Amino acid sequence: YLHHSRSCARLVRAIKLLYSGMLKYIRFQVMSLSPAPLSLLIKAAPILTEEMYGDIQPAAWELLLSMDEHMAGAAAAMFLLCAVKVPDAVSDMLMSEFHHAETVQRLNAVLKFHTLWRFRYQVWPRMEEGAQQIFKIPPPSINFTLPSPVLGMPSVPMFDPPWVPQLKNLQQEEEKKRLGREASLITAIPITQEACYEPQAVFPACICAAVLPIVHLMEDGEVREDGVAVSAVAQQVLWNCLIEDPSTVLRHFLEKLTISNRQDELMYMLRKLLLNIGDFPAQTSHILFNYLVGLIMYFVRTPCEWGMDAISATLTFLWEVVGYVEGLFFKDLKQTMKKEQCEVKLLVTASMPGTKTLVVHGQNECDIPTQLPVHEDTQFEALLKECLEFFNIPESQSTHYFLMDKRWNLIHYNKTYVRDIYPFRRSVSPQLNLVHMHPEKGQELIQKQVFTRKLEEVGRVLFLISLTQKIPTAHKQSHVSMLQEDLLRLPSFPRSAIDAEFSLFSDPQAGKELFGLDTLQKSLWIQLLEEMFLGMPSEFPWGDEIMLFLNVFNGALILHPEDSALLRQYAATVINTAVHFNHLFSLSGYQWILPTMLQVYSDYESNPQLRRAIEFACHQFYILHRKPFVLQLFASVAPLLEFKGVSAQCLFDLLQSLEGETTDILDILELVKAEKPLKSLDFCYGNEDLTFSISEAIKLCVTVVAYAPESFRSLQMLMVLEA
């Protein structure tokens, strides 16, 4: 075929040398002779039969890699028309080429895909002067809608573009321009698209579906004999496609979720693409974030069989996506989400009203429905009990009957609050069914749905963490203050961040998975609250409200004290808060934390690792605050002392661990943000007093009594001395 093209080019040159308007025809409508057949068939596309398309497909496929640009463009147009008309054959050919046993074949398949991508915009001009009225091409059927305002910045403008036309001051302006150019990435923008001065596109669903094999070939390390690897070509092609227009690249994948249950694979492929490319350009990240949020919104609004599962799957990845979106701010996020009535699903600080009532149907269709008023503290257990009493079920089948939602496929766990799941106060109350089920089947469904919901909550927390970490050095304090006030005004913040499914942990089936998710969620909540704390002013005027945020830490240490990861995360974050909020924790604060640590230390006496970690944390506390910390420790152990409760011997064990240096077995210090050789945060206590003698503790208690003998704190310290 290359010989044929060279022969045709030589004939064209000979004809040119033979010769007015004929030269114009030669240079404007011949331009070569090789594409004359293909460009003919493109002109007869409406009248081509399916057999003709199948027969022309292999030729147009092979001719895509021509040096001649006209031949390549005509072949691309013809193959795009074939994919429009015979998607099955085109898809089979694409899969055979992408999974071909020869390295050269796969590399050529990726290169041909790139040529198709280039000539995507040059199909209608080659087709016919009156087409696109005939030869109807199905438009991309978009099902969901993006958020009404775009969440992030559409793209980051390149600093000082060469294609945009515009002495200390001159020198500083030149330095500023140089720094801006060095800070702006030119490989992450469509260079030729933006450099052209100022038109539909043909790219059917099979050609878009070809991106998945290219994503997989991004990892295909097979090297051609010319030294070119398939992975490099695939990465370059996909990078250029995502740079130019990510919408067409991701159209197929985004539509497939609404089309069918394919979320567990869409998220897998998106994660694979992100990992192999290693980043996300601003436009790509913006588009992907908006489409994922719109998908969550769609599955919230349209009742679908796999809607909750798709929402969980997309929440498992939106946190990775959001780390690259540019110009996304928490206030705009809240505004758009509460405009869209979808804030609860991706913002862990939502604050929706509730339902205030709901209608529960009976098992029988002729049964008269019941209506239960919903209050803030009502859980589905009370509603189920009332429904069982109402619909005349004589306690013979009390575990057979489950509250269920049919519009949204939901079976309600008893210990879940009604307003958490039905948060909107719309005119129409939720409608439930008293579905009779075999108890094991009902419990299996409840376990599965609770696991999915917990994974959604994990994703929400991770999304918020990534959003906070993306925020620049400026706007950090504003964002943190917004988070703190949102948590405070949230009526169910500590309960949401601290609760657990104790009725579901005991099940030998699907019980341990929930426990693993719970440990992950508690660790994530600790990390999120530490992120909020570090970013607030160090001298923030606190009160009794700090407990509301510290109880979560304590909660995480009640459920999972023996988990080493959770234990060292707790110790690291408590040390970070003691260092950061130094003034608060030099007078108070330890009183919000120490009683829980003492209770855990006394409870798990048989666990030497937990006791060692608690003793190391207390040693670090004494290093930071020396005498105030000991006084707060005694004040927080005095109520717990007994003559269950913290014993009088475990307190002495903690003190004896304080006096002697303890090794860090769990590497707690490596997670401390201010990781230095820890010193006394007060200069007055600055001294080589690393040793905390028990005699010093006795002197401290004696002094607290001597200060005010009749104080209540005096009798607390007297009890501590007596112990």
Binding site: P494, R495, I498, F502, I558
Partner: peptide
């Protein structure tokens, strides 16, 4: 955990 939750509820009620 229920004791912690009740303490939190009382704290919110007081505020």
């Amino acid at each position: 955990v229920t004791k912690i939750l009740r303490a939190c509820t009382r704290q919110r009620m007081l505020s």
